[PDB]
Design a protein around this ligand. Structure first.
Ligand SMILES: [Cl-]
Ligand SMILES: [Cl-]
Ligand SMILES: [Mg+2]
Length: 270
């Protein structure tokens, strides 16, 4: 029978949902994509009902929004993945078919040239420079307990200055050197456009958002279908996903053609 794939209404989701569909069709299934079906719980409730068979979720989103679990003091990638896999199965029979290989986290970003010059790769590397750096922050992230205050508590430093600004011209602000550090999503195409580097949250101040294919419980008992999905296991790292999003956002390529090119290059299709 047809396999209907859900998606949330943005770039990465359009690309991955079409990717899964193309791979399934190459392997004998008929597939349909519902692009931009809705948000997290629109998709998840659809998945429980079998109105869709699968979609791409993120571990931290499942932990916080689907399962509504109490946040830990420090966030560990593996522990959150484990609690989400166990929690989705226990609650609704939903199966984690595959980790895709990338994270779409809220992270700290700096200019790449500056990071390269100073050997900076992770958030703890900023401590030495923090009293020289300007942080650019929307007001909510600077004030709320699990934003800037959490980073400061976990990492034990403060910046020279905090400039309040809304996200619309924030990449412009870091490019123009108004600020030196901003919060950014790790797969945002603008991180490539504006030549920034994402920093590793090495002490776990912020949640992890590992991309996972999740599947209706009964759909998941089809071992042929599961085997096809596992062909994407660990296939797409964060750098790659960001580059695919760039194709969509900057190069104006369509989601299906982005997805198709990738699978063809990998030898998964043709
Ligand atoms: Cl929703
Ligand atoms: Cl969340
Ligand atoms: Mg790259």
């Amino acid at each position: 029978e047809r396999v209907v794939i859900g998606s949330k209404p943005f770039n990465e989701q359009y690309i991955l949902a079409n990717m899964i569909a193309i791979l399934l069709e190459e392997n004998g299934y008929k597939a349909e994509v519902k692009e931009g079906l809705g948000g997290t719980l629109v998709n998840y409730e659809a998945l429980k009902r079998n109105d869709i068979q699968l979609y791409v979720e993120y571990t931290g989103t499942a932990y916080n929004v689907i399962l509504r679990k109490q946040p830990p003091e420090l966030w560990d990638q593996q522990y959150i993945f484990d609690e989400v896999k166990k929690g989705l199965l226990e609650a609704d029979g939903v199966v984690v078919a595959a980790k895709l290989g990338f994270r779409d986290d809220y992270a700290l970003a700096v200019r790449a040239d500056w990071a390269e010059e100073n050997g900076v790769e992770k958030i703890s590397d900023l401590a030495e420079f923090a009293d020289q750096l300007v942080f650019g922050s929307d007001p909510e992230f600077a004030s709320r307990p699990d934003g800037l205050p959490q980073i400061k508590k976990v990492y034990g430093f403060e910046f020279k200055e905090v400039k309040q600004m809304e996200p619309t011209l924030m990449y412009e602000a870091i490019k123009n050197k108004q600020v030196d550090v901003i919060p950014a999503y790790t797969t945002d195409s603008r991180v490539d456009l504006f030549n920034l580097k994402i920093l590793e949250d090495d002490k776990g101040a912020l949640p992890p958002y590992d991309a996972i294919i999740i599947v209706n419980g009964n759909t998941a008992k089809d071992e042929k279908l599961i085997s096809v999905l596992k062909l994407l296991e660990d296939r797409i790292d964060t750098d790659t996903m960001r580059a695919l999003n760039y194709q969509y956002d900057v190069e104006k390529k369509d989601a299906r053609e982005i997805a198709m090119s990738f699978l063809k290059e990998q030898g998964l299709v043709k």
